[PDB]
Amino acid sequence: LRSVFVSGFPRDVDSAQLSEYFLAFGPVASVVMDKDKGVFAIVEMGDVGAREAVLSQSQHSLGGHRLRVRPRDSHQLAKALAEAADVGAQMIKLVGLRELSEAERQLRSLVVALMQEVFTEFFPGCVVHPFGSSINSFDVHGCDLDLFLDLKAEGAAMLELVGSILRGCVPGVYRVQTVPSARRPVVKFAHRPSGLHGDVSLSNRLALHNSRFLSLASELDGRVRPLVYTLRAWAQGRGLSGSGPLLSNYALTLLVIYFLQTRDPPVLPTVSQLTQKAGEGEQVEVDGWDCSFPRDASRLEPSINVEPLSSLLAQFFSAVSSWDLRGSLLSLREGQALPVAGGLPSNLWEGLRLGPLNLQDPFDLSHNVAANVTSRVAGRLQNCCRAAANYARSLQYQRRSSRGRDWGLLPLLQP
Ligand SMILES: [Mg+2]
Ligand SMILES: [Mg+2]
């Protein structure tokens, strides 16, 4: 597909002139005007890279006329987002569509209850804590159900025992696979009646609190869920968020939250500030790290930041693209970037893994959630952010479309 659809050039303009214009971007193979009609025309470039170079620039003009050059479940999403009022309404609608329905959530709680009632007989006093995607209120349709069982060879034996229990005892669950061989040992399971799948971890415990923190963030400000959902969909769109060297959903969420912490008025407070507001009985530590923070966001002061969702999204793209990733450790606790060269963040907090992208976990401070991210992924993240930022400054992002044209979020959510 080296050919591009080009329309909008003035009446009585030569195809040789279009050829001459597109000649700047590279070799032009052919230019064919619409024969019986007029208006648009098709331009085939010599190189596919030249075609990508033409599509790369959103600003085209000839003879004083601006040119439109375009290459030439999900459909429900696009249609619904096209029906919205503006960018903000689009983001909120995206949240409403992707988020779990109440039936799904209560179904999840029911399944958790089943698992608990089965496990309690084998391990008296054991507690099954749902964590991650389900309880952090960033949940999406068909997301994993991750359970933590609260009670390295003995760990493997115990893991196999849990696998056996899931296999032969609790009714309805199939696809049981024990995985001791991973950084965090886990037992994969699938419950058939509820149509759910997930992982059971022996000790993930710290992560549980992380989830809670995330939830609190969503309760602290109303823009958090739209921003995080939208940026999740976007990162998954550009191939940024993911499994391998790609960013994890948790790391991305942490990045968005950090961005919200770094705004001129803060949208979210720093984790340290939350720890200060914890209070008696809410004090909790895990592996030496302080995990404490308020139960409800009601007794916490609101955000004086008046920035709308659109401006916050554009500011996210711009700021993330503008940051220095390799030389900075992004801190959620202090809500700011701590310089790597000088300040030696690796001295205190021993075991901290630095690199292309450094993002510090709000509780365990020796943990870089972005440590897995390679140079290519980081650079491509900043590049995509620069792109999206330049797009957010256009009229296509800011305003709606009269009929049928993709506007606002829709170009950002496409592959
Ligand atoms: Mg019973
Ligand atoms: Mg999973």
For residue 13, the CA-to-ligand 1 centroid distance in Å is 81
* CA 155–ligand 2 middle distance (angstroms): 20
Q: Tokens 């049928």 label which residue?
A: 404
| Resolution in units of Å | 3.2
The technique by which this structure was obtained is X-ray
Query: Please, which residues have CB within 8 angstroms of residue 26's CB and are 6 or more apart in sequence?
Result: 45, 46, 47, 49, 50, 51, 53, 54
Alpha-carbon torsion (397, 330, 182, 129), positive or negative: negative
Torsion of CA 47, 50, 55, 59, to 10 degrees: -150
Rounded Cα–Cα distance for residues 135 and 255 (Å): 19
Count how many residues are written for the chain.
Answer: 415
Q: Of the ligands numbered here, which is closest to the C-alpha atom of 170?
A: 1
The pocket of ion ligand 2, defined by CB under 5 A, consists of 144
CA–centroid distance, 114 to ligand 1, in Å, is 9
Within its chain, how far is the Cα of 348 from the centroid? 30
Residue 47 marked in a binding site: no
Sorted by where each begins, the domain ranges of the chain are 1-72, 73-415
Q: Which ligand is nearest to the CA of 188?
A: 2
CATH dotted code for 1-72: 3.30.70.330
Pairwise CA distance, residues 92 & 88, whole Å: 6
